[PDB]
Amino acid sequence: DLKWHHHNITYWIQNYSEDLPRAVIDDAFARAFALWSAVTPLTFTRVYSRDADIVIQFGVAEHGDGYPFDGKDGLLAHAFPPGPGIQGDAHFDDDELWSLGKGVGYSLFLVAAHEFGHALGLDHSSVPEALMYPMYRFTEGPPLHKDDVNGIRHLYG
Ligand SMILES: CC(C)ON([C@@H](C(=O)N=O)C(C)C)S(=O)(=O)c1ccc(-c2ccccc2)cc1
Ligand SMILES: [Ca+2]
Ligand SMILES: [Ca+2]
Ligand SMILES: [Ca+2]
Numbered sequence: 001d002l003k004w005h006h007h008n009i010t011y012w013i014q015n016y017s018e019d020l021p022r023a024v025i026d027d028a029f030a031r032a033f034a035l036w037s038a039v040t041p042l043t044f045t046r047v048y049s050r051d052a053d054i055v056i057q058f059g060v061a062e063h064g065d066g067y068p069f070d071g072k073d074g075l076l077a078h079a080f081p082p083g084p085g086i087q088g089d090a091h092f093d094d095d096e097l098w099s100l101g102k103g104v105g106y107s108l109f110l111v112a113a114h115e116f117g118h119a120l121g122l123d124h125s126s127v128p129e130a131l132m133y134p135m136y137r138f139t140e141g142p143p144l145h146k147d148d149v150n151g152i153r154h155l156y157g
């Protein structure tokens with residue numbers, strides 16, 4: 001689907017990377033969601049249930065959906081567009097080192113914010129400063145660009 005048809009989105013952290021403490025991973029995901037909820041009518045609530053809209057997984061190689069990861073670097077993560085089942089879900093390649101990004105590894109916060117954009121129905125942007133641009137680059141500044149917000153408002157108002 002192009003967009004979620006309800007506004008109260010739920011998410012389930014199915015498993016964890018050992019790269020970071022669980023509370024840090026939880027917080028990284030919460031911050032990524034808060035980025036999008038500030039600019040949409042959507043809310044994001046954590047649940048402990050397989051019936052969540054956005055199921056979050058860490059995995060390596062072929063991890064059950066026919067879109068395999070590739071070891072260290074290269075592919076970082078992927079997410080399915082809105083809809084039932086696997087649709088909406090977000091998977092992170094645990095052959096990466098997940099971190100807060102400033103030093104070694106990839107920022108789990110930034111990559112999750114990008115993936116959650118796909119999970120809400122956004123495609124890749126052509127603006128290099130936008131969050132939805134198809135290349136990772138670490139930044140400590142505001143991730144959202146006009147294009148990201150215009151993209152998400154087009155879907156959600
Ligand atoms: C080369 C691109 C197109 O591939 N990426 C996947 C992707 O786009 N996943 O969303 C594809 C296979 C779906 S990615 O995993 O490498 C990747 C590249 C950049 C980012 C990214 C992360 C934070 C901020 C901006 C871009 C995330 C994954
Ligand atoms: Ca990889
Ligand atoms: Ca789903
Ligand atoms: Ca890892």
Ligand SMILES: [Zn+2]
Pocket residue numbers: 063065067078091
């Ligand atoms: Zn997957």
Ligand SMILES: [Zn+2]
Pocket residue numbers: 114118124134
């Ligand atoms: Zn992407």
